Amino acid sequence: SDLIPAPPLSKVPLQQNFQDNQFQGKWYVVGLAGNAILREDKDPQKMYATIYELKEDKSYNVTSVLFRKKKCDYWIRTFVPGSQPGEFTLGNIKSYPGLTSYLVRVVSTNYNQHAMVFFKKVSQNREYFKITLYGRTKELTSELKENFIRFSKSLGLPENHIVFPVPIDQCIDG
User: Fold this and answer.
1) Residues making up the binding site for a carboxymycobactin
2) What is the DSSP code (8-state) at residue 9?
3) Is the dihedral of CA 147, 116, 103, 97 positive or negative?
4) Which 3 state secondary structure label does DSSP give 1?
5) What residues contact residue 154 under an 8 Å CB cut-off, 6+ apart?
6) What would the DSSP string read from start to end of 107-167?
7) Annotated binding site for enterobactin: which residue ranges?
8) Strand (E) or helix (H) holding 66
9) Cα–Cα distance between 114 and 133 in angstroms, integer?
């Protein structure tokens, strides 16, 4: 493995006055960028969806659903409130083999249409980061997609590390 290095956290803005209640519900992954994300023209990445449910204790149950091998695949994360509102750590990190580190920062959102979220983790001592462009719908404007490309490039990622998953109906319409 050779990886583009994680950016310093100083280059990753935090959404001011983060509203945890308004960030809840279903988000479509309209854009994906990161040091382990590679464009694949033979088999282009399919859109998946992530559901944020705020618990009584103010941590998030995070359920993601993707269409793989004719079936809906579910995976669950717990996001624990971090240092400042809009940051999170991963609950029960010991239950993920090789994972020593996991950070979430909500970069920007208007809550009812779009969000950009930064993830950083250390797995088998390798440092991974990604940015997801979230949509409340499966389509976003040229403007929001160019904003996400610009932001991804500001963190050192070239074009072939930025993908726009293809909209689908299976699994993610529930």
Assistant:
1) 48-50, 121, 130, 134
2) G
3) negative
4) coil
5) 11
6) EEE-SSSEEEEEEEEEETTEEEEEEEEEESSS---HHHHHHHHHHHHHTT--GGGEE-PBP
7) 102, 130
8) strand 60-68
9) 7
Resolution in units of Å: 2.4
DSSP annotation of 45:
P
- The residue behind tokens 């996400």 is 148
Task: Provide the residue type at 56 as one letter.
Answer: E
Residue 16 CB-density burial (10 A; 0-12 exposed, 13-18 middle, 19+ buried): exposed
Q: From the annotation, which residues make up the binding site?
A: 48-50, 102, 121, 130, 134
- The span from the CA of 121 to the CA of 143, in Å, is 29
**Short-list 65, 23, 59, 48, CA closest to 132:** 48
| Residue 37: both structure tokens together | 């994300």
Dihedral, CA atoms, 32, 38, 44, 46, nearest 10 degrees?
A: -30
Look up residue 123 and give its amino acid.
Answer: S
Kind of pairing between the strands at 60-68 and 49-54: antiparallel
Catalogue all structural domains in the chain, each as residue range(s) with its CATH number: 1-174 (2.40.128.20)
Place of tokens 């618990």: 55
